[PDB]
Paper text:
The genes cysDN (Alvin_2448 and Alvin_2449) encode for ATPS in an unusual sulfate assimilation pathway and the gene sat (Alvin_1118) for an ATPS involved in the dissimilatory sulfur oxidation pathway, respectively. Dissimilatory sulfur-oxidizing ATPS was found to exist as a homodimer.
The asymmetric unit contains one homodimer of ATPS with rms differences between the monomers being 1.4 Å. No significant differences were detectable between them except for a rigid-body movement of the C-terminal relative to the other domains in the range of 4 Å and of segment 233∶239 which contacts the C-terminal domain. The N-terminal domain I (residues 1–172) is basically built up of a β barrel with five antiparallel strands surrounded by α-helices, the catalytic domain II (residues 173–331) of a typical Rossmann-like α/β structure and the small C-terminal domain III (residues 332–396) of a small three-strand β-sheet and two α-helices. The structure of ATPS of A. vinosum was determined without any ligand in the active site. Two MES (2N-morpholino-ethansulfonic acid) molecules (present in the crystallization solution) could be, however, identified close to the monomer-monomer interface far away from the active site. In the A. vinosum ATPS structure the active site is only occupied by water molecules; more than ten of them are visible in the electron density map. The catalytic process starts by binding APS into the empty active site groove best expressed by the A. vinosum ATPS structure present in an open form.
Numbering used by the authors:
A (entry chain A), B (entry chain B): 1 to 396
Write the structure that this text describes.
């Protein structure tokens, strides 16, 4: 198995021993407590689930400044983004060395983690601006990741945490949410030696299906982990049950036996483009993937990043040999009339534009909503049917 | 895939649509509510998870009486034990049609399910005694299943349920708890056509490892699902994560690639021997297993059942055609020095006790405590090492 990043074994922060879990849960009900931001809560779930191994909790300001500017902690460990717990005020936990962190995204704000607080620090305007410009590559308040980061308050609490649950990501998505620990176990047992990871939050049509297959053939992979971003439903997104049925139907009918793992994780998007792509590679190595697909404008928003910056950041900016996972560099696909299959256009230089047929993800979605199956070059009939049945069911 | 029992597809009671799940959770806080028994909570978890498919909720008295005496509901569907929600009284919910069921096993007694109450019935002494003697094979109050059944009150509430979570089973055991739905999907991903199910709660030593391999060879299985009963700890128990690590090490080193799934489910044991064996077969068919291992004194307690009664029940009490799943009829196993392999006892009646390598449970745990591995005919060195590491690790 590919090694975890920075250690020989994953070091998750979830309390796996049930007796210790029960004792901590009991203790937490009498501790001073704070409700954290959704960003900090996601950071805690990722730490609990082993995705951010081998880190122990939330960063002090020196580690956060070092991570933002250089992708390292002060002690030299590689980690690509700051992991901060920022609050409007630390008054409720003044002088406390042990506190409960409560979940902002579950009714009644239950305890998510217990934290040993080793520092409480105020972040200056200059420190915030430095971290913002370095992580997000802009100072524009129109950038949604910039706005969230700067909307949490300026008191940073730092120290190691013990995670008691995985929030609504597990409760709402019980069949798909997986820890990095369990994805690594499952890769191991299924016998896969090379494994491609692919992120999505919506149904996969033929273009994305074929991109996974191209990547698998190129690197001689034994399997693909489809790693779905779980979270609250965004306007125009496909509800989870329908999305899951579409992905699982594609996997069962169009891939060979024992080649697909359908899984998911919970973490708020940063919209940080090339910097977020490094974070993605980091946690995918932790879960056991050997290859990670990065296409055009990966993790991007607006016009802040160049189309392939998230690929090239791995050439220069990421320190040599900190990561063992390799990038499969994807690009736009089209159906080749000459070859009778979906290809990356860049890899068919013998073709003229007229040799391709193109149909966007937007156009596919429009057709499905009108009850018209897209051409079989772009959508599988059984996947199309699942989506058409969904759109037809709506009162709209 | 083997068909679910009594339908073409599983009909779980969990609310998979997150928006509907959120709406119901919010509604449930304002409903009349009752804290159910641990048995009823377990029933709801199994119903939520698809294991008791195609049932919609708790049974009325007529169905429970039919299930107890003939393993069928009044409409003729096969189901082998009553699923009752018994209460001391309906006072907390008098008159309400829609109610919240609260979990007795989680601090705070959170909502586990929402229920539409379609009947409320008093269970007579005669009705209770008939169900008791039929399900458990005895009316002895000293049988622990009998005692649990008769300690819940006499008001049965019945009607369909919608399940909001899987109680402490998923929270405490996030990498191993699985629904019947997910197990069936993973069996599909892995491409298995014949699948053996084996239940255990403990680490698997060479005797259980080879029992599973015997079963797989006999039926030409592609894989085995190790389906662990998850629950509450008792003093002296090996922690769940150590037990899982021992089973995963065996799976990774001693079984071929893509042959083992390590999973768990949550339910309170009935100790009903042969009747509980029929229930195990039922839910293992629903999870997608084609064969189920039943050894000696399966689900037994006391001296109420014959040592192979849990196998022979399928011959003379279970209607043909109701189950598709097949039983692998096992027995206790041990390593024979005369033969040089693990054997079931019944293929070795000629052996004397000195022809086997056998160690008591106390002997094994105490020698592992001292950093001593059992002989390699009894334990794999790598599995013994997991256990020894736990016993020699700093306590707490």
């Amino acid at each position: 198995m590919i090694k975890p990043v920075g250690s020989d074994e994953l070091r998750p922060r979830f309390v796996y021993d049930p007796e210790q879990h029960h004792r901590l849960s009991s203790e937490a009900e009498s501790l001073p407590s704070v409700i954290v931001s959704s960003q900090a809560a996601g950071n805690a779930v990722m730490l609990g689930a082993g995705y951010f191994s081998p880190l122990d909790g939330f960063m002090n300001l020196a580690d956060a400044l070092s991570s933002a500017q250089s992708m390292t902690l002060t002690d030299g460990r590689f980690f690509p983004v700051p992991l901060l717990c920022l609050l409007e005020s630390a008054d409720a936990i003044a002088g406390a060395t042990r506190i409960a962190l409560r979940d902002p995204n579950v009714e009644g704000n239950p305890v998510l983690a217990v934290m040993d607080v080793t520092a409480v620090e105020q972040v200056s305007d200059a420190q915030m601006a430095l971290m913002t410009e370095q992580v997000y590559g802009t100072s524009d308040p129109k950038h949604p990741g910039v706005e969230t980061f700067n909307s949490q308050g300026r008191t940073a609490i730092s120290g190691p945490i013990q995670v008691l649950n995985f929030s609504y990501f597990q409760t709402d998505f019980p069949d798909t949410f997986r820890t990095a620990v369990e994805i690594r176990h499952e890769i191991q047992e299924r016998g896969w030696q090379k494994i491609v990871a692919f992120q999505t939050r919506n149904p996969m049509h033929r273009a994305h299906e074929e991109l996974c297959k191209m990547a698998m053939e190129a690197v001689e992979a034994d399997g693909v982990v489809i790693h779905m971003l779980l979270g609250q439903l965004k306007p125009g997104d496909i509800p989870a049950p329908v999305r899951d049925a579409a992905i699982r139907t594609m996997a069962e009918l169009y891939f060979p036996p024992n080649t697909v793992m359908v899984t998911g994780y919970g973490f708020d998007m940063l919209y940080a483009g090339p910097r977020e792509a490094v974070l993605h590679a980091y946690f995918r190595q932790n879960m056991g993937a050997t290859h990670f697909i990065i296409g055009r404008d990966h993790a991007g928003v607006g016009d802040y990043y160049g189309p392939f910056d998230a690929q090239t950041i791995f050439d220069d900016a990421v320190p040599t040999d900190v990561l063992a996972i390799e990038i499969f560099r994807a690009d736009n696909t089209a159906y080749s009339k000459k070859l009778g299959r979906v290809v990356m256009m860049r890899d068919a230089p013998d073709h003229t534009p007229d040799d391709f047929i193109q149909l966007s993800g937007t156009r596919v979605r429009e057709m499905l909503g009108q009850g018209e199956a897209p051409p079989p070059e772009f959508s599988r009939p059984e996947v199309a049917q699942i989506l058409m049945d969904y759109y037809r069911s709506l009162p709209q």
